[PDB]
Design a protein around this ligand. Structure first.
Ligand SMILES: *[C@@H]1O[C@H](CO)[C@@H](O[C@@H]2O[C@H](CO)[C@@H](O[C@@H]3O[C@H](CO[C@H]4O[C@H](CO)[C@@H](O)[C@H](O)[C@@H]4O)[C@@H](O)[C@H](O[C@H]4O[C@H](CO)[C@@H](O)[C@H](O)[C@@H]4O)[C@@H]3O)[C@H](O)[C@H]2NC(C)=O)[C@H](O[C@@H]2O[C@@H](C)[C@@H](O)[C@@H](O)[C@@H]2O)[C@H]1NC(C)=O
Ligand SMILES: *[C@@H]1O[C@H](CO)[C@@H](O[C@@H]2O[C@H](CO)[C@@H](O[C@@H]3O[C@H](CO)[C@@H](O)[C@H](O[C@H]4O[C@H](CO)[C@@H](O)[C@H](O)[C@@H]4O)[C@@H]3O)[C@H](O)[C@H]2NC(C)=O)[C@H](O[C@@H]2O[C@@H](C)[C@@H](O)[C@@H](O)[C@@H]2O)[C@H]1NC(C)=O
Ligand SMILES: *[C@@H]1O[C@H](CO)[C@@H](O[C@@H]2O[C@H](CO)[C@@H](O[C@@H]3O[C@H](CO)[C@@H](O)[C@H](O)[C@@H]3O)[C@H](O)[C@H]2NC(C)=O)[C@H](O[C@@H]2O[C@@H](C)[C@@H](O)[C@@H](O)[C@@H]2O)[C@H]1NC(C)=O
Ligand SMILES: *[C@@H]1O[C@H](CO)[C@@H](O[C@@H]2O[C@H](CO)[C@@H](O[C@H]3O[C@H](CO)[C@@H](O)[C@H](O)[C@@H]3O)[C@H](O)[C@H]2NC(C)=O)[C@H](O[C@@H]2O[C@@H](C)[C@@H](O)[C@@H](O)[C@@H]2O)[C@H]1NC(C)=O
Lengths: 238, 87, 239, 87
């Protein structure tokens, strides 16, 4: 129902375009399955150079904007945003999501956000404080399937960086059937996993069972010390 | 963490597999090593970082290193996550 | 047409849109300008220039497809000037990726002219002078179907788009009737011959034997021979 | 050069026409007058500025004032410029 082309930044972040407002003001965002808020930099960003290095949202230039003003803040896995909630139409691919709430950020940590190519983040995890973009998609009947999917390509100068599909799957980007596992805790997109093996060696710690979530907004793998030390030792990483 | 490996030594590194839904999801060294830069100044960073956190049980974050070789489906209606070999 | 660029209208006096330069693409706001032929953006190496520091800059060392050039480049516009050096990179416009595009990264910019404007740089669409323009590389690389590009410029209003540039075609939703086509008479600007200029039905006489004009999306107003403009401004009572 | 007009008098100003390809391309006052500022503080500026330059003949620059009411096609393959009423 909607395809979003993604840019691969050095294999460490992936982002695509969205529009906010009428007419659409364009933003580059990370589509992040590990977080639940939508924020972009505000036109009202006083002294956050991060904000001024990036595309800014101007509610006065949008005919579908509806004020909210509620205070909002987010403490990421390193950094954090603050601003106020606003409502506008958000355009994604062919989809127009109405009455979508987002934070227009009036402060951002520069250390974290200034040296990044994306403007903001579109959270795809389960709802916390605001109805996320996806839930609105569902509520407004805009998707054919209650599913979204990611293809993330390797970092290759002349290739597409990846592709996100709302409301379906792109069969050109996988082989075989998907192996599906139930969500075990609805916060992140979290599920159960078993043993983690080095070659056919067991690392033991997760053999009785672990948890994992799939986080497109995270670069690497993060896991239990007991297993990671084994892996990093085995492969001779510092 | 931010541990590095000798870029010349990936050819003999082991695969690392995650068991999910009873199926082994392997990662090759080419997949689990993050390369920074090109040809000569390339740095090779381990994609495995330590983080001790619990939500119900010991928790892994499977980021872009995993989501590259495995095409991922987030099934909200059925509350499932699905993985297939990427292409 | 193979690529559509949405334009922002700033107070009816400038129109601009987005491009990316580099891998991954660094973003810039640029005027698409049929009155000039060079592509330039502010350089990360900008030398005592306040205009740069307030605008988005290009950092060659952040781009994996950057190729050094370093040849001196300068541009004296219809107001002031920018100076820098040539560099080469991929230029992303809409979904086209123009490879091997040369552009100036400006290390000095005329503050009086560029410092307090909403765009970062300028993408020239006129005929080649010292470097192969973006449009020619587009054509050369087969990125467009038709060897044509077109502009819809809207009035300055709040619910509406500012405008739309189409590379490689037309948008029929933004015109009525057939286009009247005239041949380019001097290949520098997109220049063509014109006839008499009339105030109502009154001839202004001076261009009756034939004058020249070029279409300049990077210019705000209409500029012309004093001998005619004096008459028009008198007629409308400007002063 | 920043000549202003009385905003009240656009309804008694004439159309100004350019002949191109033998066809008249008119501009109404509402098109050739630039509005600056808003609602009540608005200033009305003449869109016609004087500039004497010659390249084959006396030269006009048809900037945004003209390219707003006329949609413009730049035909590189045939080296043509085309104008039609914008919509
Ligand atoms: C300014 O912005 C904030 C942030 O977006 C707004 O606050 C949130 O608003 C949403 C609605 O868009 C809230 O979610 C909704 O919650 C209800 C259930 O209520 C929850 O809290 C109740 C009491 O406070 C409690 O009774 C209940 O059990 C539960 O914990 C859902 O029914 C509703 O879901 C339905 O609609 C959505 C889509 O709209 C669908 O996805 C669902 O399937 C259902 O059809 C939705 O999930 C959210 O909880 C609010 N969070 C916070 C902390 O603000 C704020 O909205 C205004 O204030 C809130 C508190 C509500 O009263 C709004 O109705 C109210 O407008 C914004 N201000 C305004 C006025 O726009
Ligand atoms: C650093 O940057 C400058 C500014 O661009 C370069 O100089 C210019 O390079 C371009 C080449 O990209 C020259 O244009 C070409 O000139 C030839 C000869 O007339 C044309 O045949 C060629 O056209 C063909 O290819 C085009 C695309 O490349 C098509 O559009 C044509 O239709 C056709 O297929 C194109 O017109 C400029 O004339 C040249 N300008 C000047 C005065 O500097 C530097 O390029 C190098 O130096 C040049 C003088 C020339 O030797 C090039 O071959 C060199 O690459 C550039 N330096 C580096 C390191 O590239
Ligand atoms: C100066 O130039 C303007 C703009 O071209 C002229 O006004 C416009 O004239 C058109 C035809 O002469 C009008 O078009 C009609 O539109 C309606 C829409 O429902 C059609 O049904 C109809 O059949 C025509 O196509 C157009 O409405 C009008 N544009 C406006 C309103 O600004 C102007 O013409 C003069 O004013 C108009 C209002 C009429 O009174 C004309 O008779 C009159 O000549 C031009 N003025 C001069 C000096 O010629
Ligand atoms: C680590 O994982 C990778 C990917 O899972 C392994 O490489 C691939 O392994 C498959 C076998 O599962 C191999 O397939 C060939 O085997 C058959 C020969 O007629 C045929 O059934 C098949 O279609 C292929 O010809 C495939 O070529 C290979 N491709 C890669 C490297 O991407 C890897 O093992 C490798 O393959 C085995 C067969 C052997 O050649 C090893 O030396 C290769 O490195 C796994 N490595 C380890 C150390 O287990």
């Amino acid at each position: 129902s909607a395809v979003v082309a993604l840019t691969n930044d050095r294999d460490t972040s992936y982002f695509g375009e969205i529009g906010i407002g009428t007419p659409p003001q364009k933003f580059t965002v990370i589509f992040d399955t590990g977080s639940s808020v939508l924020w972009v930099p505000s036109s009202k960003c006083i002294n956050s150079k991060a904000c001024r290095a990036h595309s800014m949202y101007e509610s006065s230039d949008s005919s579908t904007y509806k004020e909210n003003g509620t205070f909002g803040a987010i403490i990421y896995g390193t950094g954090s945003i603050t601003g106020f909630f606003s409502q506008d139409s958000v355009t994604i691919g062919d989809l127009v999501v109405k009455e979508q709430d987002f934070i227009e950020a009036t402060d951002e940590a520069d250390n974290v956000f200034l040296h990044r190519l994306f403007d903001g983040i579109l959270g795809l995890s389960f709802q916390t404080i605001s109805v996320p973009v996806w839930y609105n998609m569902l509520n407004q009947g805009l998707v054919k399937e209650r599913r979204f999917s990611f293809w993330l390509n390797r970092n290759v100068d002349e290739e597409e960086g990846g592709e996100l599909v709302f409301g379906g799957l792109d069969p050109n980007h996988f082989r075989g059937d998907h192996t599906y596992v139930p969500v075990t805790y609805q916060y992140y997109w979290q599920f159960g996993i078993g043993d983690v093996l080095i070659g056919d060696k067991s690392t033991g710690f997760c053999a009785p069972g672990c948890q994992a979530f799939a986080d497109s907004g995270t670069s690497l793998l993060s896991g239990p010390t007991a297993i990671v030390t084994q892996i990093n030792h085995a492969i001779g990483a510092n | 963490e931010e541990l590095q490996v000798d870029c010349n030594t990936l050819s003999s590194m082991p695969n690392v597999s995650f068991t999910i839904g009873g199926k082994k999801f392997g990662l090759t060294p080419e997949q689990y090593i993050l390369k920074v830069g090109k040809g000569e100044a390339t740095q090779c960073i381990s994609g495995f970082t330590a983080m001790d956190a619990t939500l119900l049980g010991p928790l892994w974050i499977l980021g872009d290193v995993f989501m590259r070789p495995y095409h991922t489906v987030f099934d909200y209606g059925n509350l499932l996550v699905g993985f297939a070999e990427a292409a």
